PDB file of all heavy atoms in Angstrom:
ATOM      1  N   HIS A 154     152.097  80.020  82.543  1.00  0.00           N
ATOM      2  CA  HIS A 154     151.983  79.898  81.086  1.00  0.00           C
ATOM      3  C   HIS A 154     153.194  79.154  80.552  1.00  0.00           C
ATOM      4  O   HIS A 154     153.067  78.229  79.733  1.00  0.00           O
ATOM      5  CB  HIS A 154     151.923  81.283  80.424  1.00  0.00           C
ATOM      6  CG  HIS A 154     151.881  81.215  78.923  1.00  0.00           C
ATOM      7  ND1 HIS A 154     150.768  80.855  78.223  1.00  0.00           N
ATOM      8  CD2 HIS A 154     152.853  81.447  77.997  1.00  0.00           C
ATOM      9  CE1 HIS A 154     151.035  80.836  76.931  1.00  0.00           C
ATOM     10  NE2 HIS A 154     152.299  81.186  76.770  1.00  0.00           N
ATOM     11  N   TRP A 155     154.384  79.545  81.001  1.00  0.00           N
ATOM     12  CA  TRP A 155     155.612  78.882  80.564  1.00  0.00           C
ATOM     13  C   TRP A 155     155.615  77.417  81.030  1.00  0.00           C
ATOM     14  O   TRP A 155     155.877  76.496  80.246  1.00  0.00           O
ATOM     15  CB  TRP A 155     156.845  79.596  81.132  1.00  0.00           C
ATOM     16  CG  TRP A 155     158.150  79.058  80.602  1.00  0.00           C
ATOM     17  CD1 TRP A 155     158.877  79.534  79.532  1.00  0.00           C
ATOM     18  CD2 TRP A 155     158.873  77.929  81.097  1.00  0.00           C
ATOM     19  NE1 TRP A 155     159.995  78.770  79.350  1.00  0.00           N
ATOM     20  CE2 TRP A 155     160.029  77.776  80.286  1.00  0.00           C
ATOM     21  CE3 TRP A 155     158.672  77.031  82.164  1.00  0.00           C
ATOM     22  CZ2 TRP A 155     160.968  76.764  80.509  1.00  0.00           C
ATOM     23  CZ3 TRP A 155     159.603  76.016  82.372  1.00  0.00           C
ATOM     24  CH2 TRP A 155     160.741  75.890  81.553  1.00  0.00           C
ATOM     25  N   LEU A 156     155.314  77.179  82.305  1.00  0.00           N
ATOM     26  CA  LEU A 156     155.298  75.826  82.858  1.00  0.00           C
ATOM     27  C   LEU A 156     154.266  74.913  82.231  1.00  0.00           C
ATOM     28  O   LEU A 156     154.438  73.695  82.175  1.00  0.00           O
ATOM     29  CB  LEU A 156     155.063  75.870  84.370  1.00  0.00           C
ATOM     30  CG  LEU A 156     156.207  76.516  85.146  1.00  0.00           C
ATOM     31  CD1 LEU A 156     155.779  76.895  86.546  1.00  0.00           C
ATOM     32  CD2 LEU A 156     157.381  75.532  85.169  1.00  0.00           C
ATOM     33  N   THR A 157     153.176  75.499  81.753  1.00  0.00           N
ATOM     34  CA  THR A 157     152.123  74.707  81.126  1.00  0.00           C
ATOM     35  C   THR A 157     152.592  74.314  79.724  1.00  0.00           C
ATOM     36  O   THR A 157     152.489  73.153  79.320  1.00  0.00           O
ATOM     37  CB  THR A 157     150.818  75.512  81.021  1.00  0.00           C
ATOM     38  OG1 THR A 157     150.389  75.902  82.339  1.00  0.00           O
ATOM     39  CG2 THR A 157     149.721  74.696  80.347  1.00  0.00           C
ATOM     40  N   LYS A 158     153.095  75.298  78.998  1.00  0.00           N
ATOM     41  CA  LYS A 158     153.573  75.079  77.639  1.00  0.00           C
ATOM     42  C   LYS A 158     154.851  74.239  77.560  1.00  0.00           C
ATOM     43  O   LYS A 158     155.004  73.391  76.681  1.00  0.00           O
ATOM     44  CB  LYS A 158     153.815  76.415  76.935  1.00  0.00           C
ATOM     45  CG  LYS A 158     154.466  76.287  75.573  1.00  0.00           C
ATOM     46  CD  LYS A 158     154.479  77.617  74.840  1.00  0.00           C
ATOM     47  CE  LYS A 158     155.265  78.674  75.606  1.00  0.00           C
ATOM     48  NZ  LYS A 158     155.228  79.987  74.901  1.00  0.00           N
ATOM     49  N   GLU A 159     155.782  74.470  78.486  1.00  0.00           N
ATOM     50  CA  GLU A 159     157.037  73.740  78.445  1.00  0.00           C
ATOM     51  C   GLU A 159     157.118  72.513  79.358  1.00  0.00           C
ATOM     52  O   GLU A 159     157.806  71.554  79.003  1.00  0.00           O
ATOM     53  CB  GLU A 159     158.181  74.701  78.763  1.00  0.00           C
ATOM     54  CG  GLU A 159     158.229  75.930  77.868  1.00  0.00           C
ATOM     55  CD  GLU A 159     158.581  75.618  76.424  1.00  0.00           C
ATOM     56  OE1 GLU A 159     158.582  74.431  76.036  1.00  0.00           O
ATOM     57  OE2 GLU A 159     158.878  76.561  75.667  1.00  0.00           O
ATOM     58  N   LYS A 160     156.432  72.523  80.495  1.00  0.00           N
ATOM     59  CA  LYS A 160     156.535  71.392  81.415  1.00  0.00           C
ATOM     60  C   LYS A 160     155.248  70.638  81.755  1.00  0.00           C
ATOM     61  O   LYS A 160     155.195  69.875  82.724  1.00  0.00           O
ATOM     62  CB  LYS A 160     157.172  71.872  82.716  1.00  0.00           C
ATOM     63  CG  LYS A 160     158.562  72.443  82.501  1.00  0.00           C
ATOM     64  CD  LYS A 160     159.651  71.509  83.003  1.00  0.00           C
ATOM     65  CE  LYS A 160     159.687  70.181  82.264  1.00  0.00           C
ATOM     66  NZ  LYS A 160     160.823  69.345  82.746  1.00  0.00           N
ATOM     67  N   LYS A 161     154.201  70.853  80.961  1.00  0.00           N
ATOM     68  CA  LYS A 161     152.945  70.149  81.178  1.00  0.00           C
ATOM     69  C   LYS A 161     152.340  70.315  82.565  1.00  0.00           C
ATOM     70  O   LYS A 161     151.752  69.379  83.123  1.00  0.00           O
ATOM     71  CB  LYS A 161     153.156  68.651  80.892  1.00  0.00           C
ATOM     72  CG  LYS A 161     153.551  68.328  79.451  1.00  0.00           C
ATOM     73  CD  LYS A 161     153.925  66.849  79.291  1.00  0.00           C
ATOM     74  CE  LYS A 161     154.143  66.462  77.825  1.00  0.00           C
ATOM     75  NZ  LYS A 161     154.280  64.988  77.638  1.00  0.00           N
ATOM     76  N   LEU A 162     152.480  71.511  83.144  1.00  0.00           N
ATOM     77  CA  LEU A 162     151.942  71.802  84.466  1.00  0.00           C
ATOM     78  C   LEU A 162     150.457  71.398  84.505  1.00  0.00           C
ATOM     79  O   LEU A 162     149.986  70.758  85.446  1.00  0.00           O
ATOM     80  CB  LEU A 162     152.099  73.297  84.781  1.00  0.00           C
ATOM     81  CG  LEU A 162     151.582  73.780  86.140  1.00  0.00           C
ATOM     82  CD1 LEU A 162     152.358  73.094  87.260  1.00  0.00           C
ATOM     83  CD2 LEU A 162     151.728  75.306  86.247  1.00  0.00           C
ATOM     84  N   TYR A 163     149.719  71.793  83.460  1.00  0.00           N
ATOM     85  CA  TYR A 163     148.306  71.445  83.334  1.00  0.00           C
ATOM     86  C   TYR A 163     148.131  70.774  81.978  1.00  0.00           C
ATOM     87  O   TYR A 163     148.622  71.276  80.968  1.00  0.00           O
ATOM     88  CB  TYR A 163     147.398  72.679  83.379  1.00  0.00           C
ATOM     89  CG  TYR A 163     147.569  73.536  84.608  1.00  0.00           C
ATOM     90  CD1 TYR A 163     148.046  74.841  84.495  1.00  0.00           C
ATOM     91  CD2 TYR A 163     147.313  73.036  85.871  1.00  0.00           C
ATOM     92  CE1 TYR A 163     148.258  75.623  85.599  1.00  0.00           C
ATOM     93  CE2 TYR A 163     147.518  73.824  87.010  1.00  0.00           C
ATOM     94  CZ  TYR A 163     148.001  75.107  86.856  1.00  0.00           C
ATOM     95  OH  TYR A 163     148.248  75.899  87.950  1.00  0.00           O
ATOM     96  N   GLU A 164     147.466  69.622  81.969  1.00  0.00           N
ATOM     97  CA  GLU A 164     147.172  68.886  80.749  1.00  0.00           C
ATOM     98  C   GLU A 164     145.646  68.806  80.733  1.00  0.00           C
ATOM     99  O   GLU A 164     145.000  69.174  81.713  1.00  0.00           O
ATOM    100  CB  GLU A 164     147.771  67.476  80.795  1.00  0.00           C
ATOM    101  CG  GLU A 164     149.256  67.477  80.979  1.00  0.00           C
ATOM    102  CD  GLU A 164     149.858  66.069  81.067  1.00  0.00           C
ATOM    103  OE1 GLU A 164     149.337  65.242  81.856  1.00  0.00           O
ATOM    104  OE2 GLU A 164     150.832  65.802  80.342  1.00  0.00           O
ATOM    105  N   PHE A 165     145.071  68.318  79.652  1.00  0.00           N
ATOM    106  CA  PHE A 165     143.613  68.256  79.566  1.00  0.00           C
ATOM    107  C   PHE A 165     142.987  67.382  80.655  1.00  0.00           C
ATOM    108  O   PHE A 165     141.974  67.741  81.246  1.00  0.00           O
ATOM    109  CB  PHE A 165     143.167  67.729  78.197  1.00  0.00           C
ATOM    110  CG  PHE A 165     141.699  67.948  77.921  1.00  0.00           C
ATOM    111  CD1 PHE A 165     141.258  69.141  77.358  1.00  0.00           C
ATOM    112  CD2 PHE A 165     140.762  67.002  78.290  1.00  0.00           C
ATOM    113  CE1 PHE A 165     139.896  69.392  77.160  1.00  0.00           C
ATOM    114  CE2 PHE A 165     139.389  67.235  78.110  1.00  0.00           C
ATOM    115  CZ  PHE A 165     138.952  68.432  77.541  1.00  0.00           C
ATOM    116  N   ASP A 166     143.583  66.228  80.912  1.00  0.00           N
ATOM    117  CA  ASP A 166     143.011  65.347  81.908  1.00  0.00           C
ATOM    118  C   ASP A 166     143.919  65.071  83.105  1.00  0.00           C
ATOM    119  O   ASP A 166     143.700  64.109  83.844  1.00  0.00           O
ATOM    120  CB  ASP A 166     142.589  64.024  81.239  1.00  0.00           C
ATOM    121  CG  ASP A 166     141.620  63.226  82.080  1.00  0.00           C
ATOM    122  OD1 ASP A 166     140.609  63.817  82.521  1.00  0.00           O
ATOM    123  OD2 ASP A 166     141.850  62.015  82.281  1.00  0.00           O
ATOM    124  N   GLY A 167     144.919  65.923  83.302  1.00  0.00           N
ATOM    125  CA  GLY A 167     145.832  65.751  84.419  1.00  0.00           C
ATOM    126  C   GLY A 167     147.019  66.695  84.432  1.00  0.00           C
ATOM    127  O   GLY A 167     146.889  67.882  84.115  1.00  0.00           O
ATOM    128  N   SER A 168     148.176  66.171  84.802  1.00  0.00           N
ATOM    129  CA  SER A 168     149.390  66.973  84.893  1.00  0.00           C
ATOM    130  C   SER A 168     150.587  66.030  84.870  1.00  0.00           C
ATOM    131  O   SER A 168     150.441  64.819  85.049  1.00  0.00           O
ATOM    132  CB  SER A 168     149.391  67.760  86.200  1.00  0.00           C
ATOM    133  OG  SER A 168     150.595  68.486  86.380  1.00  0.00           O
ATOM    134  N   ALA A 169     151.769  66.581  84.608  1.00  0.00           N
ATOM    135  CA  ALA A 169     152.976  65.767  84.614  1.00  0.00           C
ATOM    136  C   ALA A 169     153.414  65.660  86.079  1.00  0.00           C
ATOM    137  O   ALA A 169     154.376  64.972  86.405  1.00  0.00           O
ATOM    138  CB  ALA A 169     154.070  66.427  83.778  1.00  0.00           C
TER     139      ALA A 169
END
Side-chain angles (χ1 to χ4, degrees):
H154 176 75
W155 186 94
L156 294 164
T157 300
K158 173 171 61 182
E159 306 291 13
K160 301 253 63 176
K161 297 172 172 189
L162 180 63
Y163 305 116
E164 301 178 310
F165 194 87
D166 198 50
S168 176

